[PDB]
């Protein structure tokens, strides 16, 4: 059940022999998943700047192992990676002593897990390096250090953990990014089915920095913070089948309001001779608001369609309205009711929720557990159009003043095999064309594209 140690992952497959395949046989004590992906990439910086373009393919074998006694147990998954040039080969992967090499080594996950506590075996505790994550994957999607318990009955589900990064485990990157340095979450949600196939849920995070921001003179590099903050996220959650790709109702929807509250010292800098220079820090209440919803409509069994919108606030009073997210999540999820997960806000800009509104069209097929497409389309602008936007996948300055950050349109296509029932490998195109607006300026690209084939084998 949920507390499979592949339960979270995207790829939703099933190797042959395993207890999940056929239930006669016994949970398996050790397994391989290999990933081929090529990637072709053009233009992160939209033109602006050399490099920025990659054509490039990779092999990614992650072995691991896992032993059950009683209600003990243990997990580990390794990684090798090999590839032409420095691919994503992991949805997952640290954004960036933080320059990744072509090829390397990484302990992914390592964990124990004691499910005693309580008679229900969708309760458990977990200890280490594991995967967290919930369906939006818009609070928590990544493998990180934690202690989480786990709560997932008929009626009711709740978590609660504890997580901060330490290292990276990897073999190329011997620094922590400097969000990460010293900032501990805590977290939990309480949800209920109060009707079938109908979830209301609370959930809270909090963001914790013990790090200290460079004193006034001393020179700032990439791997100091710009902020320090402790930042609480209260949100409400409803949805209806939202993400289950195998919905019986005609109409699933989701719909989150979330309000960000706390404080944040700022950095500020100057550039003395092409050097930048610490000249102190201003702190300033944070109150902030974000919304996603959502509507599916389940046309027949393989045809589906949707509509979004989003909105991360932004600017304000001393930027006390700027949304962010908190940093542990993907803003992937199964929003197109396909068993394939979709960039949120787009393959190509990979949009975080922050001073961001986002407009959403999408279109699903798929064929039992065989195969399935999705095309989305988004159109995203700012909400304060003299404030930065969050992450994204785009490298390219903003214009003061221009609200329109662009249009998105993604292809998403997958084979599964190995009809099968349940199958143990797929074949998938993933694919974003992004379109830059009047924010970005003249001089930059007209088009930008990020697309991926991947081969996925689980032995
Ligand atoms: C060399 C990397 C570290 C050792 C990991 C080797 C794992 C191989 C395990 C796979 C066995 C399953 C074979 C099909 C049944
Ligand atoms: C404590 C904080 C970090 C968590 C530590 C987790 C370390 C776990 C790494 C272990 C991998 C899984 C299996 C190890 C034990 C397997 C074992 O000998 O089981 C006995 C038998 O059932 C099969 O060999
Ligand atoms: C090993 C480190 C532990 C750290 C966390 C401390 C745990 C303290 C005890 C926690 C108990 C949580 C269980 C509460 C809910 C139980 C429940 O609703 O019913 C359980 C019962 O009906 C079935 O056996
Ligand atoms: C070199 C950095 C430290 C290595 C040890 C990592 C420990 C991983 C297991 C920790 C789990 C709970 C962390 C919550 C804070
Ligand atoms: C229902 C089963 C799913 C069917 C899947 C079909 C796959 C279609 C794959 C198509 C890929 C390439 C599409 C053309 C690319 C056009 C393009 O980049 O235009 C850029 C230009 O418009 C910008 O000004
Ligand atoms: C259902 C069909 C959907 C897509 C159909 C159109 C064709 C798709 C072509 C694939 C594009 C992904 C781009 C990355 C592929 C890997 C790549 O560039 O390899 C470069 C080399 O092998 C290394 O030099
Ligand atoms: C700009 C986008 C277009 C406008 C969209 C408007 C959508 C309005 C937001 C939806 C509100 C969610 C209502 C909650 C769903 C669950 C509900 O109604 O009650 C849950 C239970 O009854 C509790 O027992
Ligand atoms: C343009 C983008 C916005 C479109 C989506 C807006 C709507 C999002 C969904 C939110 C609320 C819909 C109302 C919930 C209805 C479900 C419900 O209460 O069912 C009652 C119960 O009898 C079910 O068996
Ligand atoms: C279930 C039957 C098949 C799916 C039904 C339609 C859903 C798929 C359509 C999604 C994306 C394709 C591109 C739409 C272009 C949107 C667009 O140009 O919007 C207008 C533009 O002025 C900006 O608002
Ligand atoms: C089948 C279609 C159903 C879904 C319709 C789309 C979802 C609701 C659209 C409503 C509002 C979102 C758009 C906000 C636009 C704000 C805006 O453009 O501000 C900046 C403006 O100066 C343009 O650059
Ligand atoms: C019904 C399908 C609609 C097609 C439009 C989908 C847009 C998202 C996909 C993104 C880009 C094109 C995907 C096909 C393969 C692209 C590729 O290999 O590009 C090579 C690159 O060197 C282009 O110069
Ligand atoms: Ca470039
Ligand atoms: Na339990």
Known sequence: GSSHHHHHHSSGLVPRGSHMANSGEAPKNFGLDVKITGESENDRD???????????????????AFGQWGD????????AVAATDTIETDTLQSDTG???????LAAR??????????????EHLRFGRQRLREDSGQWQDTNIEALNWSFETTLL????????RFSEYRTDLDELAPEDKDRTHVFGDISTQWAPHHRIGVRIHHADDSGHLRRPGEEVDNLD???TGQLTWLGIEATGDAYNYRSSMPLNYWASATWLTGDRDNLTTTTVDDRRIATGKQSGDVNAFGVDLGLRWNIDEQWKAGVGYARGSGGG????????????ESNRSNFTGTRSRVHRFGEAFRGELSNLQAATLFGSWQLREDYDASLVYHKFWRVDDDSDIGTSGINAALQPGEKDIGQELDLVVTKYFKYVDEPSALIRFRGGLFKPGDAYGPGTDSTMHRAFVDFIWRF
């Open 317 to 328: 009073k001393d930027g006390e309205e700027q949304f962010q997210q908190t940093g542990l």
């Open 225 to 227: 913070k710009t902020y």
């Open 46 to 64: 939209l033109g602006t700047a050399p490099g920025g373009t990659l054509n490039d393919i990779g092999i990614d074998l992650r072995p691991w």
């Open 109 to 122: 996950e390592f964990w124990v897990d004691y499910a005693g506590l309580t008679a229900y075996p969708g």
């Open 157 to 164: 589900n709740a978590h609660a953990g504890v997580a901060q």
């Open 98 to 104: 933080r320059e990744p090499d072509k090829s390397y």
């Open 72 to 79: 003990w147990s243990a997990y580990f998954m390794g990684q």
